[PDB]
Amino acid sequence: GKIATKYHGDIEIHEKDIVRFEQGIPGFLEEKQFVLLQLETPFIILQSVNTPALGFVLIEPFSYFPTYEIDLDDNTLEQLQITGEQDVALYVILTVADPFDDTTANLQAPIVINVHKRLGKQVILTNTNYKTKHRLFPEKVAKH
């Protein structure tokens, strides 16, 4: 099938490309089908198959946040059929700034995918030190 996208133009996608988010994503419960499209960069677009403008910029968190450590709740593990960490790909969503060096990531709400089962969820971590905005880069502007 063919879809429109935010960053890639019109593309052809296969059924086996689709990751199903059975609960949608927070704010958009009706958005249950996404494809992951590499920004030809360490960046991947979480692209809705139904709504072209709904395309989020993702990174794999450890590339910028090497100590990122989360503990998924039992309900999420069941919903995504996760048996161990080998089943899982993790991503965090960026809030892209201009200039890019001011970009932040939401470490509180990672995207969690069981890759081989093609199932996804955005998990909101409630028990943790992580916040909605963590800079990807150290501060450059001088400060007292």
Short mmCIF file of N, CA and C in Angstrom, two decimals:
data_model
loop_
_atom_site.label_atom_id
_atom_site.label_comp_id
_atom_site.label_asym_id
_atom_site.label_seq_id
_atom_site.Cartn_x
_atom_site.Cartn_y
_atom_site.Cartn_z
N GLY A 1 0.81 -1.20 0.00
CA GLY A 1 0.00 0.00 0.00
C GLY A 1 0.84 1.26 0.00
N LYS A 2 0.20 2.38 -0.25
CA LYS A 2 0.88 3.67 -0.36
C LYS A 2 0.35 4.59 0.72
N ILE A 3 1.25 5.37 1.33
CA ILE A 3 0.86 6.36 2.32
C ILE A 3 1.57 7.67 2.02
N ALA A 4 1.02 8.77 2.51
CA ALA A 4 1.78 10.01 2.61
C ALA A 4 2.47 10.07 3.97
N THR A 5 3.56 10.84 4.04
CA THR A 5 4.38 10.91 5.26
C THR A 5 4.77 12.36 5.54
N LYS A 6 5.36 12.55 6.72
CA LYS A 6 5.80 13.89 7.12
C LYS A 6 7.11 14.28 6.46
N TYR A 7 8.06 13.35 6.37
CA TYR A 7 9.42 13.66 5.96
C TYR A 7 9.92 12.88 4.76
N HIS A 8 9.20 11.87 4.28
CA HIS A 8 9.71 10.96 3.27
C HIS A 8 8.97 11.03 1.94
N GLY A 9 8.00 11.92 1.80
CA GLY A 9 7.13 11.91 0.64
C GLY A 9 6.22 10.69 0.64
N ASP A 10 5.59 10.45 -0.51
CA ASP A 10 4.73 9.28 -0.63
C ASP A 10 5.58 8.02 -0.77
N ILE A 11 5.30 7.01 0.05
CA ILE A 11 6.07 5.78 0.02
C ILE A 11 5.15 4.56 -0.04
N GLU A 12 5.74 3.43 -0.41
CA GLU A 12 5.04 2.15 -0.43
C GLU A 12 5.43 1.38 0.82
N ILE A 13 4.43 0.86 1.53
CA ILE A 13 4.70 0.11 2.75
C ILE A 13 4.06 -1.27 2.62
N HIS A 14 4.68 -2.24 3.28
CA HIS A 14 4.19 -3.61 3.31
C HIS A 14 3.49 -3.87 4.64
N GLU A 15 2.57 -4.84 4.63
CA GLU A 15 1.88 -5.23 5.86
C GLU A 15 2.87 -5.61 6.95
N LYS A 16 3.96 -6.28 6.59
CA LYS A 16 4.94 -6.72 7.57
C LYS A 16 5.79 -5.59 8.12
N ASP A 17 5.63 -4.37 7.60
CA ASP A 17 6.34 -3.22 8.13
C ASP A 17 5.61 -2.58 9.30
N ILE A 18 4.32 -2.87 9.46
CA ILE A 18 3.47 -2.10 10.37
C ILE A 18 3.67 -2.59 11.80
N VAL A 19 3.90 -1.65 12.72
CA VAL A 19 3.88 -1.93 14.15
C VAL A 19 2.52 -1.50 14.68
N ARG A 20 1.81 -2.44 15.30
CA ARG A 20 0.50 -2.15 15.87
C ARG A 20 0.66 -1.66 17.31
N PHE A 21 0.04 -0.52 17.59
CA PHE A 21 -0.07 0.04 18.94
C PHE A 21 -1.53 -0.16 19.35
N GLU A 22 -1.79 -1.21 20.12
CA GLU A 22 -3.18 -1.60 20.38
C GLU A 22 -3.94 -0.55 21.18
N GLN A 23 -3.24 0.24 22.00
CA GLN A 23 -3.87 1.33 22.73
C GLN A 23 -3.66 2.68 22.07
N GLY A 24 -3.21 2.70 20.81
CA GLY A 24 -2.82 3.96 20.24
C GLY A 24 -1.61 4.51 20.97
N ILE A 25 -1.48 5.84 20.93
CA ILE A 25 -0.50 6.52 21.76
C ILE A 25 -1.24 7.56 22.59
N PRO A 26 -0.73 7.94 23.76
CA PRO A 26 -1.41 8.96 24.58
C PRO A 26 -1.68 10.21 23.76
N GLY A 27 -2.91 10.70 23.82
CA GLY A 27 -3.35 11.81 23.03
C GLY A 27 -4.02 11.41 21.73
N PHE A 28 -3.74 10.20 21.23
CA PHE A 28 -4.20 9.76 19.92
C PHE A 28 -4.50 8.26 19.98
N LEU A 29 -5.54 7.91 20.75
CA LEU A 29 -5.84 6.49 20.95
C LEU A 29 -6.24 5.79 19.66
N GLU A 30 -6.70 6.54 18.66
CA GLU A 30 -7.17 5.98 17.40
C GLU A 30 -6.03 5.66 16.46
N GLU A 31 -4.82 6.10 16.78
CA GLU A 31 -3.65 5.89 15.94
C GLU A 31 -2.97 4.60 16.37
N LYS A 32 -3.36 3.50 15.72
CA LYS A 32 -2.94 2.17 16.11
C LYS A 32 -1.95 1.52 15.15
N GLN A 33 -1.57 2.19 14.06
CA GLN A 33 -0.69 1.62 13.05
C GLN A 33 0.40 2.63 12.72
N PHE A 34 1.65 2.22 12.92
CA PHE A 34 2.80 3.06 12.62
C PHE A 34 3.85 2.27 11.86
N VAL A 35 4.66 2.99 11.11
CA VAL A 35 5.86 2.42 10.51
C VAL A 35 7.05 3.23 11.00
N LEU A 36 8.20 2.58 11.11
CA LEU A 36 9.44 3.22 11.54
C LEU A 36 10.30 3.46 10.32
N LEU A 37 10.61 4.73 10.05
CA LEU A 37 11.31 5.13 8.84
C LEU A 37 12.61 5.82 9.21
N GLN A 38 13.73 5.23 8.80
CA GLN A 38 15.03 5.84 9.08
C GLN A 38 15.15 7.18 8.37
N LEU A 39 15.65 8.17 9.10
CA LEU A 39 16.03 9.46 8.54
C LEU A 39 17.41 9.25 7.93
N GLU A 40 17.41 8.84 6.66
CA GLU A 40 18.58 8.27 5.98
C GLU A 40 19.95 8.65 6.53
N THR A 41 21.51 9.38 9.74
CA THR A 41 21.34 9.98 11.05
C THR A 41 21.00 8.91 12.07
N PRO A 42 21.16 9.22 13.36
CA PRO A 42 20.68 8.30 14.40
C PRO A 42 19.18 8.45 14.64
N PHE A 43 18.46 9.03 13.69
CA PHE A 43 17.07 9.40 13.87
C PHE A 43 16.16 8.49 13.05
N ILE A 44 15.06 8.09 13.68
CA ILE A 44 14.02 7.26 13.08
C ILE A 44 12.71 7.99 13.25
N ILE A 45 11.86 7.98 12.22
CA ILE A 45 10.54 8.61 12.28
C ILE A 45 9.51 7.56 12.65
N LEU A 46 8.77 7.80 13.73
CA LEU A 46 7.58 7.01 14.04
C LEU A 46 6.43 7.62 13.25
N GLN A 47 6.06 6.99 12.13
CA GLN A 47 5.15 7.58 11.14
C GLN A 47 3.80 6.87 11.17
N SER A 48 2.74 7.63 11.42
CA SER A 48 1.40 7.07 11.32
C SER A 48 1.10 6.65 9.88
N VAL A 49 0.50 5.47 9.73
CA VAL A 49 0.05 4.97 8.43
C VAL A 49 -1.25 5.62 7.97
N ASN A 50 -1.96 6.29 8.87
CA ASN A 50 -3.24 6.90 8.53
C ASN A 50 -3.22 8.42 8.49
N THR A 51 -2.29 9.06 9.20
CA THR A 51 -2.26 10.51 9.35
C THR A 51 -0.87 11.02 9.00
N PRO A 52 -0.67 11.56 7.79
CA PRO A 52 0.69 11.94 7.36
C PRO A 52 1.41 12.88 8.31
N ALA A 53 0.72 13.85 8.91
CA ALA A 53 1.41 14.83 9.75
C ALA A 53 1.87 14.25 11.07
N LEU A 54 1.37 13.07 11.46
CA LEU A 54 1.73 12.47 12.74
C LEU A 54 3.00 11.66 12.52
N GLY A 55 4.15 12.33 12.61
CA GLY A 55 5.44 11.67 12.49
C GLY A 55 6.43 12.19 13.51
N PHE A 56 6.75 11.38 14.51
CA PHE A 56 7.62 11.79 15.61
C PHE A 56 9.07 11.41 15.35
N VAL A 57 9.98 12.27 15.81
CA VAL A 57 11.42 12.02 15.67
C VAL A 57 11.89 11.22 16.87
N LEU A 58 12.47 10.04 16.61
CA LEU A 58 12.92 9.13 17.65
C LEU A 58 14.43 8.97 17.60
N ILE A 59 15.02 8.69 18.76
CA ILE A 59 16.38 8.18 18.84
C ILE A 59 16.35 6.92 19.67
N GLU A 60 17.34 6.07 19.46
CA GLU A 60 17.61 5.04 20.44
C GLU A 60 18.27 5.72 21.64
N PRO A 61 17.72 5.58 22.84
CA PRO A 61 18.15 6.45 23.95
C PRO A 61 19.60 6.31 24.34
N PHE A 62 20.17 5.11 24.26
CA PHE A 62 21.51 4.90 24.81
C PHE A 62 22.57 5.64 24.02
N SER A 63 22.26 6.05 22.79
CA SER A 63 23.22 6.80 21.98
C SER A 63 23.56 8.15 22.60
N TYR A 64 22.61 8.75 23.32
CA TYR A 64 22.82 10.03 23.97
C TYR A 64 22.71 9.96 25.49
N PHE A 65 22.13 8.90 26.04
CA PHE A 65 21.82 8.78 27.46
C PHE A 65 22.28 7.40 27.88
N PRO A 66 23.59 7.23 28.07
CA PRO A 66 24.15 5.88 28.24
C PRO A 66 23.70 5.17 29.49
N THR A 67 23.29 5.88 30.54
CA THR A 67 22.83 5.23 31.76
C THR A 67 21.31 5.08 31.82
N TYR A 68 20.60 5.37 30.72
CA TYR A 68 19.15 5.23 30.71
C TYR A 68 18.77 3.81 31.09
N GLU A 69 18.01 3.68 32.18
CA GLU A 69 17.61 2.37 32.68
C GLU A 69 16.17 2.48 33.15
N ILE A 70 15.31 1.62 32.61
CA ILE A 70 13.89 1.63 32.95
C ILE A 70 13.47 0.24 33.38
N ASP A 71 12.38 0.19 34.13
CA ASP A 71 11.84 -1.07 34.61
C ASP A 71 10.38 -1.10 34.17
N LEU A 72 10.09 -1.92 33.17
CA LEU A 72 8.74 -1.98 32.63
C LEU A 72 7.81 -2.70 33.59
N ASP A 73 6.59 -2.19 33.71
CA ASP A 73 5.58 -2.75 34.58
C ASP A 73 5.04 -4.06 34.01
N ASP A 74 4.47 -4.89 34.90
CA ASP A 74 4.01 -6.21 34.50
C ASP A 74 2.95 -6.14 33.41
N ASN A 75 2.07 -5.14 33.49
CA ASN A 75 1.02 -5.01 32.48
C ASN A 75 1.59 -4.73 31.10
N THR A 76 2.60 -3.85 31.01
CA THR A 76 3.23 -3.59 29.72
C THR A 76 3.92 -4.84 29.18
N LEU A 77 4.63 -5.57 30.04
CA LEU A 77 5.30 -6.78 29.58
C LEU A 77 4.30 -7.77 28.99
N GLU A 78 3.15 -7.92 29.65
CA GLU A 78 2.11 -8.81 29.13
C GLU A 78 1.54 -8.29 27.81
N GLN A 79 1.18 -7.00 27.76
CA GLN A 79 0.55 -6.45 26.56
C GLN A 79 1.44 -6.60 25.34
N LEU A 80 2.75 -6.44 25.52
CA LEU A 80 3.69 -6.51 24.42
C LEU A 80 4.34 -7.88 24.27
N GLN A 81 3.92 -8.85 25.08
CA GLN A 81 4.43 -10.23 25.01
C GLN A 81 5.95 -10.30 25.13
N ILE A 82 6.50 -9.54 26.08
CA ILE A 82 7.94 -9.44 26.26
C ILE A 82 8.39 -10.51 27.25
N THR A 83 9.34 -11.35 26.83
CA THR A 83 9.90 -12.39 27.70
C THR A 83 11.26 -12.00 28.26
N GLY A 84 11.96 -11.07 27.62
CA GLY A 84 13.29 -10.67 28.03
C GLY A 84 13.71 -9.49 27.18
N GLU A 85 14.85 -8.91 27.53
CA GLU A 85 15.26 -7.69 26.84
C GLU A 85 15.60 -7.94 25.37
N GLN A 86 15.90 -9.18 24.98
CA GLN A 86 16.20 -9.46 23.58
C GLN A 86 14.99 -9.24 22.67
N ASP A 87 13.79 -9.15 23.24
CA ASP A 87 12.59 -8.96 22.45
C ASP A 87 12.33 -7.50 22.09
N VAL A 88 13.03 -6.55 22.73
CA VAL A 88 12.58 -5.17 22.85
C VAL A 88 13.51 -4.23 22.10
N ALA A 89 12.92 -3.29 21.37
CA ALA A 89 13.62 -2.09 20.94
C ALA A 89 13.02 -0.89 21.67
N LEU A 90 13.89 -0.02 22.18
CA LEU A 90 13.49 1.15 22.93
C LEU A 90 13.85 2.42 22.16
N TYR A 91 12.97 3.41 22.22
CA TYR A 91 13.19 4.70 21.59
C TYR A 91 12.65 5.77 22.52
N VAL A 92 13.21 6.97 22.41
CA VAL A 92 12.60 8.14 23.04
C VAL A 92 12.34 9.21 21.99
N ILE A 93 11.32 10.01 22.23
CA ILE A 93 10.89 11.03 21.27
C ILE A 93 11.59 12.34 21.56
N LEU A 94 12.08 12.98 20.50
CA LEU A 94 12.75 14.26 20.61
C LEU A 94 11.79 15.42 20.43
N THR A 95 12.08 16.50 21.14
CA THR A 95 11.52 17.81 20.85
C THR A 95 12.65 18.57 20.18
N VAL A 96 12.59 18.66 18.85
CA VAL A 96 13.68 19.17 18.04
C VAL A 96 13.72 20.69 18.13
N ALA A 97 14.89 21.22 18.47
CA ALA A 97 15.07 22.66 18.60
C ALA A 97 15.86 23.22 17.42
N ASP A 98 15.78 24.54 17.27
CA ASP A 98 16.65 25.31 16.39
C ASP A 98 17.42 26.30 17.25
N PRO A 99 18.75 26.18 17.37
CA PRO A 99 19.62 25.21 16.70
C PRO A 99 19.44 23.81 17.26
N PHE A 100 19.88 22.80 16.52
CA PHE A 100 19.62 21.42 16.92
C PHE A 100 20.23 21.09 18.28
N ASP A 101 21.30 21.79 18.67
CA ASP A 101 22.01 21.46 19.90
C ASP A 101 21.19 21.76 21.15
N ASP A 102 20.02 22.39 21.02
CA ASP A 102 19.12 22.61 22.15
C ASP A 102 18.03 21.56 22.22
N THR A 103 18.11 20.52 21.38
CA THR A 103 17.08 19.50 21.34
C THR A 103 17.06 18.70 22.65
N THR A 104 15.86 18.31 23.07
CA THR A 104 15.68 17.51 24.27
C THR A 104 14.96 16.21 23.92
N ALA A 105 15.03 15.27 24.86
CA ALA A 105 14.30 14.01 24.77
C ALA A 105 13.41 13.83 25.99
N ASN A 106 12.26 13.18 25.79
CA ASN A 106 11.36 12.82 26.89
C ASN A 106 11.74 11.42 27.37
N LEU A 107 12.55 11.36 28.42
CA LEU A 107 12.96 10.08 29.00
C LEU A 107 11.89 9.46 29.89
N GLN A 108 10.86 10.22 30.27
CA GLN A 108 9.78 9.67 31.08
C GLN A 108 8.85 8.75 30.28
N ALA A 109 8.78 8.90 28.96
CA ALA A 109 7.75 8.24 28.16
C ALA A 109 8.34 7.57 26.93
N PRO A 110 9.13 6.51 27.12
CA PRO A 110 9.72 5.82 25.98
C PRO A 110 8.71 5.06 25.13
N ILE A 111 9.06 4.91 23.86
CA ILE A 111 8.39 4.00 22.93
C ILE A 111 9.04 2.62 23.07
N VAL A 112 8.22 1.60 23.33
CA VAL A 112 8.70 0.25 23.59
C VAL A 112 8.07 -0.66 22.54
N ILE A 113 8.90 -1.40 21.80
CA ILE A 113 8.41 -2.24 20.72
C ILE A 113 8.93 -3.66 20.90
N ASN A 114 8.02 -4.63 20.85
CA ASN A 114 8.40 -6.02 20.64
C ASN A 114 8.59 -6.18 19.14
N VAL A 115 9.85 -6.26 18.71
CA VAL A 115 10.16 -6.16 17.29
C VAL A 115 9.54 -7.32 16.51
N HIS A 116 9.77 -8.56 16.95
CA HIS A 116 9.34 -9.69 16.13
C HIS A 116 7.83 -9.91 16.18
N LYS A 117 7.15 -9.41 17.21
CA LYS A 117 5.70 -9.48 17.30
C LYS A 117 5.02 -8.25 16.71
N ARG A 118 5.80 -7.22 16.36
CA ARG A 118 5.26 -6.01 15.74
C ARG A 118 4.22 -5.32 16.64
N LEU A 119 4.51 -5.23 17.93
CA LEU A 119 3.62 -4.60 18.90
C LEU A 119 4.34 -3.46 19.61
N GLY A 120 3.64 -2.33 19.79
CA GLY A 120 4.25 -1.15 20.38
C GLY A 120 3.36 -0.51 21.44
N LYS A 121 4.01 0.23 22.33
CA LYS A 121 3.32 1.01 23.34
C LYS A 121 4.19 2.20 23.70
N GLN A 122 3.57 3.35 23.95
CA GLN A 122 4.27 4.44 24.63
C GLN A 122 3.97 4.33 26.12
N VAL A 123 5.01 4.07 26.92
CA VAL A 123 4.88 3.79 28.34
C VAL A 123 5.22 5.06 29.09
N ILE A 124 4.37 5.47 30.02
CA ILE A 124 4.62 6.63 30.86
C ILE A 124 5.12 6.10 32.20
N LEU A 125 6.39 6.35 32.50
CA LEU A 125 7.01 5.84 33.72
C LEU A 125 6.64 6.74 34.89
N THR A 126 6.06 6.15 35.94
CA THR A 126 5.53 6.91 37.06
C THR A 126 6.40 6.85 38.31
N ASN A 127 7.41 5.98 38.34
CA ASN A 127 8.15 5.69 39.56
C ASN A 127 9.58 6.23 39.53
N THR A 128 9.88 7.17 38.63
CA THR A 128 11.26 7.39 38.24
C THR A 128 11.67 8.86 38.32
N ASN A 129 12.98 9.05 38.21
CA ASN A 129 13.66 10.34 38.22
C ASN A 129 13.64 11.04 36.87
N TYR A 130 13.17 10.37 35.82
CA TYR A 130 13.26 10.89 34.47
C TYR A 130 12.16 11.92 34.21
N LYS A 131 12.50 12.91 33.39
CA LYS A 131 11.63 14.05 33.11
C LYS A 131 11.28 14.10 31.63
N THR A 132 10.42 15.06 31.28
CA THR A 132 9.95 15.21 29.91
C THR A 132 10.95 15.92 29.01
N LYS A 133 11.98 16.55 29.57
CA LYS A 133 12.96 17.27 28.77
C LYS A 133 14.33 17.01 29.37
N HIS A 134 15.16 16.27 28.64
CA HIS A 134 16.58 16.11 28.95
C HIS A 134 17.35 16.53 27.71
N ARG A 135 18.25 17.51 27.87
CA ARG A 135 19.11 17.91 26.76
C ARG A 135 19.96 16.75 26.25
N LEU A 136 20.04 16.64 24.92
CA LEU A 136 20.93 15.66 24.30
C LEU A 136 22.39 16.09 24.39
N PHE A 137 22.65 17.39 24.52
CA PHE A 137 24.00 17.92 24.48
C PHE A 137 24.28 18.76 25.71
N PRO A 138 25.54 18.82 26.14
CA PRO A 138 25.87 19.69 27.27
C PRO A 138 25.59 21.15 26.94
N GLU A 139 25.43 21.94 27.98
CA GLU A 139 25.21 23.37 27.79
C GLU A 139 26.46 24.02 27.19
N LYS A 140 26.27 24.91 26.22
CA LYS A 140 27.41 25.66 25.71
C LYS A 140 27.45 27.10 26.20
N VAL A 141 26.30 27.71 26.48
CA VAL A 141 26.28 29.11 26.86
C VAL A 141 26.87 29.26 28.25
N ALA A 142 27.71 30.28 28.42
CA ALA A 142 28.36 30.52 29.70
C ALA A 142 27.34 30.95 30.74
N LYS A 143 27.56 30.52 31.97
CA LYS A 143 26.69 30.87 33.08
C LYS A 143 27.54 30.92 34.33
N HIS A 144 27.17 31.79 35.26
CA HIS A 144 27.86 31.87 36.53
C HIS A 144 27.63 30.59 37.33
#
